[PDB]
Design a protein around this nucleic acid. Structure first.
Ligand SMILES: [Mg+2]
Ligand SMILES: [Mg+2]
Ligand SMILES: [Mg+2]
Lengths: 315, 48, 100, 52, 141, 95, 88, 49
RNA sequence: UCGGAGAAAAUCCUCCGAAUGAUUAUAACCUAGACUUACAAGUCAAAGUAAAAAUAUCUUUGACCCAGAUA
């Protein structure tokens, strides 16, 4: 009686949801399943509050916000952290580095040019058709002077023979500062080739800070190379060999399905018959037959038959 | 002949089916309207 | 009659198996477990049955449940028992059908 | 008391189904699914079957 | 040809592979509780005293896309942490991130008064205009 | 029943069995559900569906029906267009 | 071989190749198979009917688009989002 | 039918009727048990030469 | 004969009712897997398809034969 009682449904709901998050003794569903910036920040706010026009629009409920300005500011402040969530959510950190997690810090930007009028961007989790990815994409990531780089683009789940391995698409090395044309093309650019009926493949862009120029002669690949046995590649072991001078700083990944252009890639240059896959569900469970299916309909016999066509044996 | 006679019978009744359903909804609604209308009389409000 | 728990916690249960029959809500539907008209509990997936307690939030529309919930003391919330089946197999797998 | 009545489809089909009506009320008419027409049509009372 | 060699069984590891295809499992129980949990993704909008937050969370409980009025970039371009336009603006910001993340189909479960609330109605309009579908498609069996 | 008839000295079929049950050659017996035509106005829709089905008989019931009929009713019948053509045989039965 | 084959008229050939590109082998031949029976007669008969149906459906214009199935709805909606995402 | 022809029990040179099938013991007919004759059955069609 | 309740899975143990109606948004077909059960009878139900654009909501019983009524 001393404690007050929730006077509204929402109060209980907010209490309940917060209550659910906390761990409990009893089994539950979840178990099984700087200062100067502050001062400057405040000062800008006060100016915004003073503006009468801001008040009038708000009370007239006609105000609006510029999305582009927020996006750029969001990138500076906490974009690294949100990007990390997507990478963990999409499984990049577990499939790439065997569970190691790195916060992206370089605001990497990639877009696939469609003709010349417009260019398709590649954000985190975006959808880009293989036709759109036929040619290599423009990359601008605001390196600043010096600080050599290496750009690595790979499809994590596109391998056709070994599950763990993945296929390199193009690898640029010794990229000095912003300019990317000055990079050694160890791996030539290949169009994405996701098999038909194989679901959505996730392709990611990886940028590594380079302390000192290192010749990646082992990772150099002949240009052009159309052999999948040579495109097989593990990010995890590769980063081990270069972890001294390679530290990741950028991310960008997109999802793509199969497409008619994929048919061209499998035949024209890969020079192999294209693989076709289908989603197969497991056979339905039926209890073991009984010689006498007592109290069962006539359909019982059809459940355990394989061929729908009559047979005659000796006749 | 039986098949054709049956088919045309269904078609003729089906042709008038839309209107008949419309009429039966009007009767059902007005039946409800009388209940709600006489329920909401100002005389009922006078008691309220 | 013979009301009770047909399937106990830790049992492999196929898609349609009935888990419990109840005159009153002794247990409540959980995840991948459905309700019958007679309030019996049946699995909706193939998996392992689990009984676990969790907070109860009712549908806003029903008046009686909301009123009782609101009248609860601010300190805590009421609980109930829920039944769960943990799916034990993947939905499906991709296989090579043809090479063109 | 209550009587069992035979509601007959008015779509021209012979389809009908039995329903229960309170003898004090007026003759029952319902919208019901006609399998032979695959549509929802009016069913109109035609006969009394028995007294429930 | 070495290239022709292909493993008999493909093993796609993308977490959203089955969900995107539409064959992934959605929880169908919780019949006695509100809201239903037959959603691949859910939109949670919380109106506190200060600020207003909108989230997108998977069934496993990991938030994917979050838009909050407590974020520096949004605050400087708004006038008040709580407002009807705020809801609209944060919804537009949330949608662009949602489109950015590739989450096109989502489940929203408002309460009766919340659904009737004008601010939430406007927020849904922004998401619908943005192209984010507030109702998920049925599962494929 | 009659084990040794006066005129022929044979077993006799119980015709009430032949009028209610169907024998599939594999050894199974089919039957209807009791009451499937009775008082349908007060039965639930699911209950009516259960009643309409053809259902198999138990091992003991099958043993009794075998005793009450003669061998003529257990033979192979090659009826053209038989609707039970597929159900006279058992497939993938390990037991 | 779809293109070389002359018994099919050329206008039909082009439509068939575009419509059923998925069934054309790298050699350019149109490969269709049937595995629905234990007797190869019906399997061959099923295969032949597909050829006849494919030719007939290409010959006749499919003006009707029909209703949009949920699969088409999902495909259309995701396509629109891609367009809006590429406002650049 | 192919088995009977291969082993010489049915003569393919002459026309085949129910008498020839019965004479070669390829089929057993019981008129008293309501048999009206023999129906050709598709089984074995793939290998019939 | 059956249903509800205490003793608590015993009783010639102690109570209340039912051989129901009301209410209607009318509540299909088909089909995995289970409950209950000597037999008979009685329950729950995913998926698919079809009507519509939320289920019927309150909470039970009588077999076979044999007679009816109809399209
Ligand atoms: Mg014989
Ligand atoms: Mg039984
Ligand atoms: Mg269903």
């Amino acid at each position: 009686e001393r404690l007050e009682k929730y006077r509204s449904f929402e109060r209980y709901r907010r209490r309940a949801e917060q209550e659910a998050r906390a761990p409990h003794w009893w089994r539950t569903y979840r178990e099984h399943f700087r200062t100067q910036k502050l001062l400057e920040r405040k000062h800008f706010l006060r100016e915004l509050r003073a503006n009468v026009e801001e008040e009038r629009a708000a009370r007239l409920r006609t105000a609006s916000i510029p999305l582009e300005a927020v996006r750029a500011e969001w990138e500076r402040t906490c974009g690294p952290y949100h990007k990390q969530r997507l990478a963990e959510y999409y499984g990049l950190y577990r499939d790439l580095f065997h569970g190691a997690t790195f916060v992206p810090w370089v605001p990497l930007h990639v877009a696939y040019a469609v003709g010349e009028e417009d260019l398709i961007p590649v954000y985190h989790g975006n959808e880009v058709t293989p036709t759109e990815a036929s040619r290599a994409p423009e990359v601008t990531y605001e390196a600043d002077k010096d600080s050599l780089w290496t750009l690595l683009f790979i499809n994590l789940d596109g391998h056709l023979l070994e599950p763990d391995a993945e296929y390199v698409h193009w690898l640029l090395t010794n990229i000095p500062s912003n300019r990317v044309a000055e990079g050694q093309e160890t791996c030539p650019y290949l169009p994405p080739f996701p098999a038909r009926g194989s679901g959505f493949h996730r392709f990611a862009f990886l940028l590594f800070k380079q302390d000192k120029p290192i010749n990646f002669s082992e990772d150099t690949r002949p240009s052009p190379c159309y052999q999948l046995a040579q495109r097989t590649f593990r990010t995890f072991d590769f980063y081990k060999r270069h972890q001294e001078a390679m530290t990741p700083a950028g991310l960008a990944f997109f999802q793509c399905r199969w497409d008619d252009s994929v048919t061209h890639t499998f035949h024209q240059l890969l020079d192999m018959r294209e693989p076709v896959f289908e989603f197969v569900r497991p056979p339905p469970y039926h209890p073991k037959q009984k010689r006498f299916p007592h109290e069962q309909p006539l359909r019982y016999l059809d459940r355990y038959r394989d061929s729908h066509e009559p047979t005659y044996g000796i006749y | 002949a039986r098949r054709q006679a049956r088919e045309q019978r269904i078609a003729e009744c089906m042709a008038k089916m839309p209107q008949m359903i419309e009429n039966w909804r009007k009767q059902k609604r007005e039946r409800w309207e009388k209940i709600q209308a006489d329920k909401e009389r100002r005389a009922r409000l006078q008691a309220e | 009659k013979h009301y009770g728990i047909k399937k106990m916690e830790g049992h492999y249960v196929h898609a349609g198996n009935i888990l419990g029959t109840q005159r009153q809500f002794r247990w409540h539907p959980g995840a991948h477990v459905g309700l019958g008209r007679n309030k019996c509990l049946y699995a909706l997936e193939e998996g392992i049955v689990r009984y676990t307690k969790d907070v109860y939030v009712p549908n806003p529309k029903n008046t009686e449940a909301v009123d009782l919930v609101t009248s609860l003391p601010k300190g805590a919330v009421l609980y109930k028992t829920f039944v769960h089946v943990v799916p034990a197999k993947p939905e499906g797998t991709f296989k090579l059908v043809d090479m063109l | 008391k209550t009587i069992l009545v035979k509601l007959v489809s008015q779509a021209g089909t012979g389809f009908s189904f039995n329903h229960k009506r309170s003898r004090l009320r007026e003759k029952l008419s319902l919208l019901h699914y006609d399998p032979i027409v695959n549509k929802k049509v009016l069913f109109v009372e035609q006969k009394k079957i028995r007294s429930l | 040809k070495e290239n022709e060699a292909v493993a008999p069984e493909f093993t796609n590891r993308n977490p959203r592979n089955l969900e995107l295809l539409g064959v992934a499992r959605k929880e169908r129980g919780w019949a006695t509780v509100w809201p239903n949990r037959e959603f691949w993704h859910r939109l949670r909008v919380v109106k506190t005293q200060h600020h207003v937050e909108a989230f997108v969370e998977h069934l496993n409980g990991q938030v994917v896309v979050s838009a909050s009025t407590r974020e520096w970039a949004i605050k400087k371009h708004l006038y008040s942490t709580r407002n009807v336009v705020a809801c609209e603006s944060i919804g537009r910001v949330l949608a662009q991130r949602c489109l950015e993340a590739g989450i096109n189909f989502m489940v929203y479960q408002p309460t009766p008064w919340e659904a009737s609330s004008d601010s939430i109605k406007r927020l849904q309009n922004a998401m619908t205009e943005s192209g984010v579908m507030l109702r998920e498609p049925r599962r494929i069996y | 029943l009659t084990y040794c008839s006066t005129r022929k000295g044979k077993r006799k079929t119980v015709k009430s069995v032949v009028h209610r049950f169907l024998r599939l050659h594999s050894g199974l017996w089919l039957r209807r559900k009791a009451g499937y035509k009775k008082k349908l106005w007060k039965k639930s829709t699911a209950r009516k569906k259960r009643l309409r089905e053809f259902v198999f008989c138990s091992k003991t019931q099958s043993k009794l029906l075998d005793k009450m009929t003669t061998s003529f009713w257990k033979r192979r019948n090659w009826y053209a267009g038989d609707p039970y053509q597929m159900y006279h045989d058992r497939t993938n039965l390990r037991v | 071989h779809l293109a070389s084959a002359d018994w099919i008229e050329e206008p039909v050939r082009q439509k068939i190749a575009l419509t059923h590109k998925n069934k054309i082998n790298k050699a350019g031949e149109l490969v269709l198979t049937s595995e629905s029976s234990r007797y190869q007669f019906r399997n061959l008969a099923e295969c032949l009917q597909k050829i006849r149906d494919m030719i007939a459906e290409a010959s006749q214009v499919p003006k009707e688009p029909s209703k949009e199935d949920a699969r088409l709805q999902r495909l259309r909606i995701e396509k629109m989002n891609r367009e809006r995402l590429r406002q650049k | 039918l192919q088995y009977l022809i291969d082993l010489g029990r049915v003569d393919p040179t002459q026309p085949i009727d129910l008498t020839q099938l019965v004479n070669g013991r390829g089929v057993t007919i019981q008129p008293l048990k309501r048999d009206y004759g023999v129906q050709l059955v598709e089984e074995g069609a793939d290998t019939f030469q």
